[PDB]
Specification:
homotetramer, 424 residues, alpha/beta, TIM Barrel, Pyruvate Kinase, Chain: A, domain 1, 2 domains, 8-stranded parallel beta barrel, 5-stranded mixed beta sheet, 13 strands, 16% strand, binds ligand I9Q, binds 1,6-di-O-phosphono-beta-D-fructofuranose, binds oxalate ion, binds potassium ion, transferase/transferase inhibitor, Pyruvate kinase, active site, inhibition
Chain lengths: 424, 425, 436, 419
């Protein structure tokens, strides 16, 4: 069977509670997290975190997305930081147990509309193959359309994460989210534009609306601020990280902590440690019930398969949901239901593998084998690749149950199958 | 379309509370889904003619009950032959053929402590004549079920045992009886004489709730449409009783004197069909599905895991049906236990499984008669297509509908593990 | 366990095994059903009123005394049959049987008198026979009118006009008997005092298999509105000739109570049947079992969630009193009322505690039988010089009568609902009292 | 539209979060008490007057620092600042005095703690924040050191290590309340686990109906900066959303450059966070988990809170001798302010430990007839309520009183229309 020890770990006694109050009362500091950390860490790359050797330590510590702030530096400076990130990432390609995709995100300087510097920085992003744009001071839907147009003929696959930094962006949130790939709660400017005591309301509202929409949301700025000069964070800082994860954030971010601080690697390690504890403390029973109740009926087979797979994973405490995805969409639709099971996304697209770090609980595996002539064999090889990588990484063991999500024919947009396998 | 959301009590289905769900029930909201609660009709002088049996099958009879408290082995053998003749008269059109189970209802222990010698002989008769189900009278403890199982011998291992709870001891030892039984019958006739009449509804509701929690079939029986033995229309209490048995969660409803000896056997079957269909649409699935999931324990069985995923998927897209391939009926039973609003169309080659799955609410059995294709994946597809073609002919499905298809990874029973979202073309 | 552990130690495990209390503590409706126990005996007084139709089999004073002791709370006179002279004699016999118990005020049981109209027939509105029967009702001091075939709001206005200026106090319960009445339900309920789900005609006017939907919908809407709802016709039909009912009949009575009906009715079962007293006894027995089986945890939660916010102090006091009664497993809620309204507002929240309504109005004492769980006590003493002392005497009358009738025991907690000044409409106080 | 009422009406917690509005202004009085540590930066009578106006409800004296003479002078300055507002009885704000012990250090009750606890009794302190409580016998030792004269002093056990967290239930059982002392807890257990201990202890205290304080580094950067970090405002808001009855300032008020601004910031955040509480789920869960009871004060409290929610009552006015009737109302977390009218100056100060309890110290002449005396204490609550902005003409209030004088007899709830 599973054993009594299994049910004492990852806050499983608190998970079985009948009320949110009882769930809190059952949280246990001795109940150790077992699942892989699912909230991605975005680290801003700057003077303190630029070297290839330092970047290798940040990747090992848990950095999933490298942020380049175009409010500072230059094209030449950021291109060198990007090259160093890619060199550090590819230094682990020799071993399957250490290689991890790392997304590259460009954060714009900001604005009467799209600034000349933003047009040129967005063009630099397309030319350097960036995965994501964190668009500063998005105030309305037309600001997103301008960023989308500036991404030109080659950059339509780049994700646009609109940064909400002022009163107008909060008030026009629904129209901005509708046309964006996701949102960043940019608390630095938000805390100066609106009263500081109201930022938590904007953060919780935007995270809840993004969770309802199934779109990624980033919590940002001053999460571990004191760690710019101190080796350990304050009590308010660790609670801020934990509460951003409990709020429903897909990603958490470090700015000055990694760009200029004295402890960049330790700041990444601290966010990794807290996120893992907070993810186990999520009250999935109410969260899943409310996400299902609020999500409308759907005739899209990817959406229908995703909810069935997440329900199946909860039923058997599945060690993972393995999904085949080319664009990342099938993995994103699983992630929106917040399964406790890790979502292992097997893809041939290097860009999709980097971009899916935006979605909580998605573990990308880039697959490079040549295509099989028999499509069903190519699918089976990718599914077994997900299982063998899962075994190698500690996600899975023989005897475990996994949920497998595929489609009936090749090409993006046909996901319609959920299977229960049993690991051999 | 807007019309879709006005039918089958869908406005009441979207309510946030059970009280508001009741307030939104609409007598003009017509039922669309096929009737999912099976009807058991007791065979007798009123329902023994082969031609009358054909009318009862068309009216909705799913299970024919043989009451061994009346008549000899020669009488029951003739009843079996007549039922089979009426059932097989429709086998020439495989897309519309309806299997009908045959249940043997034992005489019982009488004044004895356990299995009577007449019951031993009747049970052996049942095995020799290939009955599908045994309704075991006056089950008081787990050893009564073991005795019935032993009397069926090695040749009757596939026969379902439905324990009839008819007295105080059976109600008190319910948990141990349900554990070893395939299902239960709330036998209200004797129960209403053995315990105070005003307490029977508590025993009925409790046993139906516990069977629903266990995922095992439960039958509500006796005097449901009693006045229809002599009158063409039932009383207001009788229609209410049928509707409330379905709302309680009964998998099956039964007719005794109404079909065995009365003057309106076909009309009694038609009345139970009409009421059950209305009551099934009035079920508050939002609370029911939530509570069945919450109470059901975690499972490592792939059939169980696939079943809950398929039911969740069916609710998400308002699937017209869940088509499942099954050898023993188990994969269909595990879908049924989650009470989907979507019809569970079970395709099987086992004639016995097709008859027995009528015990599970919402399971529509289709008996597949074609010999196996050389390529197993093609044989599976042909059976799924047979489910689709039968569903289109019977009115379950139309082009454009979404259906959930439940299959397994290898031949043989026990390997269901796949759920697939399919658009009907 | 922790939510009931201290009270289980104080009241004992036997207390928590009775009146379906294990099923009452369940966290889901499914678990509540699984925990229903035929060995869990009902303890509370029967709260769903029984309406018995008075006719040839139940007319004599001696027979009526047996029916009052068996549990009849409302006597129905069907003006579709008999005559003015016949029904006046039945009414006099009912009053004689009722007043035979008036010698002991601390046990006297009021019985309401209801007139059921013949109806409009093939006409579009109020018939001439109904005008005469309604005038008879006012002249004979009837408490309630069961108005046949109500199809729209103007039908109830016509009944109200026919009762004249002297019948303003008479309750109008509109009978819903056809498709139009069901479709125009909301406008009818708005102007009526309550509703009767008259299933006999309803089962002929709409498909028989749809009556349960109309019954459950109308009971739910009346529960939401806080207005009385009666379930009627063929509930124990076979008992017209047999001494025991069918399994569908007991189920029907139990399910009408579980649906939320305030009253249940007997027609031919008491008017002409061989076993009128046994039919009343059977409805009494089933209703007590079914009331205990109600899942109060979900019901109370849903009644609060659906009921809008209120600035009426009687309404605010009523929900606070019902919440307080549930918190301590109160034996009873004693309320002082002039019109019955404060008791009706307590009843709408469906407390498990009996609502003992102390009133000086003989008519209000009879009419409150329409509201589930209201036990009327007619106070006959002249007013004390100091109003606060008069209030206290009335509360003590409720306590002493409660102890004498078996509702209250020493050590019990009772909730007492009173107002801040004399006259109807000023209830605003809730008190927790320990019985000594 | 105000006080996050659109988010309050939501059918799910997720929809409640989606409906939170930065333009929906808080209207209710700030419910979560602020504990400020008094030290070099906040000692003067003039500075203490500004801290009282900014919202300080409890003055903490940390006996790990200073001396008996130093802390006695701080206490005298607190009392002088508090009494400077006594000339207007309808607006006077009581302020509690809390002694935080040095602790056991090496190893039961230290000899320094015995002397400091004696000092506390002699100086009439209201509360003891007992450091490093790891078992029930630590609480008994503190209680014994307070002697027969300190029977009325509240003991709030500070949970600062692994043992205190593991033996939480036995500690809470014998304590008046708890302090989640995150400074030591954050080095005694892994820093990334403190939030689990905080949320668990707050939840268990809420279930028990006993006060819980969130403490340490809440607005840390404000020791040198005029504005806090984004993590610090979030931390204050989340402690209130977690269910904390009190929030605390240590170095921020004891030695920092912006003590008054730190108090103002905690006041501003707490008020916003209290309106963002999802009362629909919270009341339902507290009401479901609170055990059945035959105690009339407990029965009246749930009836009164239910009644207040039904009519959107502006306040629940309660008469209390010890603070207990107000504490039992507070445990159900009403949105309505609990205005507690008491003659006990000590109970008025101590009741700041319970969220949403606004103490009014009654100093009007006694009425000859007890029923009239009760009525004038109720009218005093109404007049103070109107002057402070809690109540207006036309509002509905719930009034909670007892049937006889003396503590322990609360059994009446009344619905009253203002003016
Ligand atoms: O708004 C602010 O002032 C805070 C910005 N927070 S940050 O995005 O993490 C940030 C980014 C950067 C730096 C920071 O110290 C810093 O803190 C640099 O010194 C720097 C120097 C030269 C080239 C590039 C960088 C650079 O990219
Ligand atoms: O027709 C219907 O659907 C209603 C019948 N159900 S009843 O209202 O209870 C009912 C009422 C009555 C009778 C009934 O047999 C009867 O059954 C009488 O014989 C009778 C005889 C003489 C005077 C008066 C009555 C009299 O009032
Ligand atoms: O970090 C800790 O270990 C706790 C310190 N946080 S505190 O309790 O608020 C605190 C308290 C005090 C001081 C602080 O600077 C301080 O910060 C003093 O300078 C001081 C000087 C002279 C007499 C008394 C005090 C005095 O009481
Ligand atoms: O998430 P996406 O981008 O829609 O991709 C999902 C697709 O992946 C598959 O599972 C496998 O497709 P490929 O063989 O083309 O990679 C498809 O059946 C399904 O449509
Ligand atoms: O419900 P059961 O009895 O377990 O049968 C389900 C079985 O039916 C199938 O779908 C088809 O099997 P067969 O081809 O042997 O009929 C299997 O893959 C699966 O194991
Ligand atoms: O339920 P009703 O009709 O409003 O009557 C309640 C009234 O009864 C009382 O309790 C007593 O009033 P009386 O003294 O006039 O009988 C009033 O204080 C209260 O307003
Ligand atoms: O909250 P506590 O300490 O029990 O005090 C409540 C007490 O206060 C009162 O309302 C007023 O009593 P006093 O007149 O003695 O102040 C009592 O009736 C009640 O018992
Ligand atoms: O731009 C940002 O990241 C901010 O303002 O927090
Ligand atoms: O045997 C039966 O069916 C009964 O007693 O109801
Ligand atoms: O009128 C009635 O009572 C009926 O039709 O049921
Ligand atoms: O003593 C304290 O307050 C601490 O350690 O946080
Ligand atoms: K920027
Ligand atoms: K039999
Ligand atoms: K009539
Ligand atoms: K200290
Ligand atoms: Mg910014
Ligand atoms: Mg029998
Ligand atoms: Mg009629
Ligand atoms: Mg400490």
């Amino acid at each position: 069977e599973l054993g009594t020890a299994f049910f004492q770990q990852q806050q499983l006694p608190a998970a079985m509670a009948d009320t949110f109050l009882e769930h809190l009362c059952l949280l246990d500091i001795d109940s150790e997290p077992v699942a892989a950390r699912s909230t991605s860490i975005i680290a801003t790359i700057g003077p303190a975190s630029r070297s290839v050797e330092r970047l290798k330590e940040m990747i090992k510590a848990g950095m999933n997305i490298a942020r380049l702030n175009f409010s500072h530096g230059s094209h030449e400076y950021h291109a060198e930081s990007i090259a160093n990130v890619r060199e550090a990432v590819e230094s682990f390609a020799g071993s399957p147990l250490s290689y991890r995709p790392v997304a590259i995100a460009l954060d714009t300087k900001g604005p009467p509309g799209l600034s000349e510097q933003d047009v040129r920085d967005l063009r630099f992003g397309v030319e350097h193959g960036v995965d994501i744009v964190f668009a500063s001071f998005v105030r309305k839907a037309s600001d997103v359309a301008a960023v989308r147009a500036a991404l030109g003929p080659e950059g339509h696959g780049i994700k646009i994460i609109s940064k909400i930094e002022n009163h107008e962006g909060v008030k026009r949130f629904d129209e901005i989210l509708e046309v964006s790939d996701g949102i960043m709660v940019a608390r630095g400017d938000l805390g100066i534009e609106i009263p500081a005591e109201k930022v938590f309301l904007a953060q919780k509202m935007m995270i809840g609306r993004c969770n309802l929409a199934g779109k990624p949301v980033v919590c940002a700025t001053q999460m571990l601020e004191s760690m710019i000069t101190k080796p350990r964070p304050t009590r308010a800082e660790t609670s801020d990280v934990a509460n951003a994860v409990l709020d429903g954030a897909d990603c958490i971010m470090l700015s000055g902590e990694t760009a200029k601080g004295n402890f960049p690697v330790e700041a990444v390690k601290m966010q990794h440690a807290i996120a893992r504890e907070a993810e186990a403390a999520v009250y999935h029973r109410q969260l899943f019930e409310e996400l299902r109740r609020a999500a409308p009926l759907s005739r899209d087979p990817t959406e229908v398969t995703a909810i069935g797979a997440v329900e199946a994973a909860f039923k058997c405490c599945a060690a993972a949901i393995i999904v085949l995805t080319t664009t990342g969409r099938s993995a994103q639709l699983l992630s929106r239901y917040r399964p406790r099971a890790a979502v292992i996304a097997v893809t041939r697209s290097a860009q999709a593998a980097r971009q899916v770090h935006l979605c909580r609980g998605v573990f990308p595996l880039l697959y490079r084998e040549p295509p099989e002539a028999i499509w069903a064999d190519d699918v089976d090889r990718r599914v077994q690749f997900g299982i063998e990588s899962g075994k190698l990484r500690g996600f899975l063991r023989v005897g475990d149950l996994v949920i497998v999500v595929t489609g009936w024919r090749p090409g993006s947009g046909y996901t319609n199958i959920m299977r229960v396998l049993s690991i051999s």
